[PDB]
Amino acid sequence: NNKRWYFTREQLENSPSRAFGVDPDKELSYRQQAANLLQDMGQRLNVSQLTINTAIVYMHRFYMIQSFTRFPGNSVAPAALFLAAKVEGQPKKLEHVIRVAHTCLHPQESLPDTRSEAYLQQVQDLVILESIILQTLGFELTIDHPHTHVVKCTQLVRASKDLAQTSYFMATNSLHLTTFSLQYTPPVVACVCIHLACKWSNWEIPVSTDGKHWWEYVDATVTLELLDELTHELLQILEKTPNRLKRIWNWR
Amino acid sequence: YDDNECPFCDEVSKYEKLAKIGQGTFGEVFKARHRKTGQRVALKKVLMENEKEGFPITALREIKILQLLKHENVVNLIEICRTKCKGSIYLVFDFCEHDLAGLLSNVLVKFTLSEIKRVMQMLLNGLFYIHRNKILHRDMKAANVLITRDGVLKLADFGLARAFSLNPNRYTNRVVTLWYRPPELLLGERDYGPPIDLWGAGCIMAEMWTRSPIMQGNTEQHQLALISQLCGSITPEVWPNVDNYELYEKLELVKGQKRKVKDRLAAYVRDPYALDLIDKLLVLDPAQRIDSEDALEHDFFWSDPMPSDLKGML
Numbered sequence: 001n002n003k004r005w006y007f008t009r010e011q012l013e014n015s016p017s018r019a020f021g022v023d024p025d026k027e028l029s030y031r032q033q034a035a036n037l038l039q040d041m042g043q044r045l046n047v048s049q050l051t052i053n054t055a056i057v058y059m060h061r062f063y064m065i066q067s068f069t070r071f072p073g074n075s076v077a078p079a080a081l082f083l084a085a086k087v088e089g090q091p092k093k094l095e096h097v098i099r100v101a102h103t104c105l106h107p108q109e110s111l112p113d114t115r116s117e118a119y120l121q122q123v124q125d126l127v128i129l130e131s132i133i134l135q136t137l138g139f140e141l142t143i144d145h146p147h148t149h150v151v152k153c154t155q156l157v158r159a160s161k162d163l164a165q166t167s168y169f170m171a172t173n174s175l176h177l178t179t180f181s182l183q184y185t186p187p188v189v190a191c192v193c194i195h196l197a198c199k200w201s202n203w204e205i206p207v208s209t210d211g212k213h214w215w216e217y218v219d220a221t222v223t224l225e226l227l228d229e230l231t232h233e234l235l236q237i238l239e240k241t242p243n244r245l246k247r248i249w250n251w252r
Numbered sequence: 253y254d255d256n257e258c259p260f261c262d263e264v265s266k267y268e269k270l271a272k273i274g275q276g277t278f279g280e281v282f283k284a285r286h287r288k289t290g291q292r293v294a295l296k297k298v299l300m301e302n303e304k305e306g307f308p309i310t311a312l313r314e315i316k317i318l319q320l321l322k323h324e325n326v327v328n329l330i331e332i333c334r335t336k337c338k339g340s341i342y343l344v345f346d347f348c349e350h351d352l353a354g355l356l357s358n359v360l361v362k363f364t365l366s367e368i369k370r371v372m373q374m375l376l377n378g379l380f381y382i383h384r385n386k387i388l389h390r391d392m393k394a395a396n397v398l399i400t401r402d403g404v405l406k407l408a409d410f411g412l413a414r415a416f417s418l419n420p421n422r423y424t425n426r427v428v429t430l431w432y433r434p435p436e437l438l439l440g441e442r443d444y445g446p447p448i449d450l451w452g453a454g455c456i457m458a459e460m461w462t463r464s465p466i467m468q469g470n471t472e473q474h475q476l477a478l479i480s481q482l483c484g485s486i487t488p489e490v491w492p493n494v495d496n497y498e499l500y501e502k503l504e505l506v507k508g509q510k511r512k513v514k515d516r517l518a519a520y521v522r523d524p525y526a527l528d529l530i531d532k533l534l535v536l537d538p539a540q541r542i543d544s545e546d547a548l549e550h551d552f553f554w555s556d557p558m559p560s561d562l563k564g565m566l
């Protein structure tokens with residue numbers, strides 16, 4: 001279904017994890033930790049940001065069905081990434097993903113012997129978990145990211161390299177820091193990102209000859225009221241994220 | 253994990269297995285009945301032979317392709333089902349009563365020129381769609397062409413299908429069953445495209461009258477030889493730049509063969525237009541081989557008797 005993986009704020013409040021006593025703010029942190037583990041492993045495995053992003057959506061969706069109480073982020077993240085790398089055509093070997101997941105999670109520990117029963121078991125745990133993910137998502141693994149739509153818009157707005165690059169940054173961070181991917185369509189999330197990037201860079205996109213605002217050419221549902229509400233939410237979580245805004249900060 | 257929530261993946265037990273229908277060349281295909289509605293479906297088990305890297309990347313590809321392709325002349329994936337040690341996965345498709353290989357191998361079955369036109373029309377329209385969506389079928393054969401009880405043709409078995417693009421492409425040469433394999437592949441091409449599926453369309457078209465696969469080789473050399481005895485011989489004059497990886501580098505080919513496509517089939521076909529289209533499909537140079545678009549435009553589909561609905565048979 002079209003609305004299967006889109007949820008109301010009330011649906012997000014009454015999450016599987018909430019049913020097992022996880023506070024809303026705790027659940028958001030569990031999601032942010034998983035996205036960071038996916039980014040850390042992804043970087044080490046040398047997979048694309050697209051692959052990492054796909055694995056983050058899997059994780060987000062997975063936890064609208066399953067509870068953090070039953071499935072820890074540190075167990076689901078490696079399986080989600082192993083799956084996403086296969087889906088996105090950058091397959092990484094099972095032994096490889098396991099070795100990287102281990103160093104991220106236990107820097108001081110030493111990987112068990114690849115002949116041990118303890119290692120054979122963690123190999124099996126990943127396989128089992130990948131299968132649980134496939135089934136939770138109901139094999140709907142093709143993800144539309146808003147980065148696709150940002151590229152389209154930042155061109156059909158004639159933005160500086162800078163503006164476009166700031167927007168992609170907003171898009172990536174919206175996956176790490178928010179549940180926008182469970183609430184708003186990628187073209188809408190793309191509008192939110194371009195809007196915030198403009199506000200941050202003091203860039204103003206002029207009104208079209210027709211009298212239409214830029215976003216009306218991207219998504220018909222989109223309103224300035226919503227854009228301002230969503231940019232404010234995203235900016236606040238970004239201000240809470242140390243060194244993240246430094247990345248886009250114009251010091252001149 | 254024994255007792256885990258799974259709203260979007262139903263257990264295959266919802267369908268009742270009626271009969272195995274895939275034992276020849278393929279793995280595990282069953283005809284089955286929805287236990288509540290009676291809806292007939294086909295269940296294809298995802299095979300876990302030497303699967304050391306979790307869920308098969310091959311199956312992920314097929315599923316991705318099946319989910320993308322939504323067209324009247326392409327098989328329809330209804331859903332994916334699980335089965336609550338180790339436990340299987342099934343691809344569920346709407347059931348199709350017949351298959352082209354079966355109807356053709358049946359002496360009692362008889363097609364009019366009008367219906368043959370219709371069959372080819374649906375087939376080529378399916379191919380146009382899939383190719384337009386950047387997918388190569390790569391396994392064109394009568395047995396992979398299905399027909400519903402309502403006379404609707406569906407392209408089936410996308411297990412070998414793959415997405416294609418627009419420096420050179422290195423696609424797998426281990427593609428297409430031998431009898432239906434185009435010259436390009438037999439000459440070692442890895443940067444191929446939609447024309448491979450059209451060569452297969454040609455072989456099937458000719459099979460609509462001959463009732464038997466026109467070129468039944470035993471090895472790649474035998475196949476290449478058989479092709480030469482029908483389509484003339486592989487010449488840089490006939491096929492510009494053919495002289496590149498073989499032709500001379502072993503692959504001992506003929507040199508005197510002359511095109512007999514229209515002469516050898518002249519008996520069975522009789523209709524001029526049908527013979528002309530087959531001749532344009534079984535073209536050696538993939539670049540000179542007609543595409544689905546132009547094939548659909550061919551006078552064969554636009555002259556009397558015009559294409560008609562399938563009632564032959566039942």
Ligand SMILES: CC(=O)N[C@@H]1CCC[C@H](C(=O)Nc2cc(-c3cnn4c3CC(C)(C)C4)c(Cl)cn2)C1
Nearest residue numbers: 271273281294345346347348349350351396408409
């Ligand atoms: C017992 C019985 O009734 N026998 C009939 C005899 C005529 C053909 C019919 C059939 O094959 N029907 C079918 C098959 C598929 C399917 C899925 N995977 N593959 C196929 C056949 C295949 C060999 C191409 C591999 C689908 Cl999707 C729908 N209907 C079965």
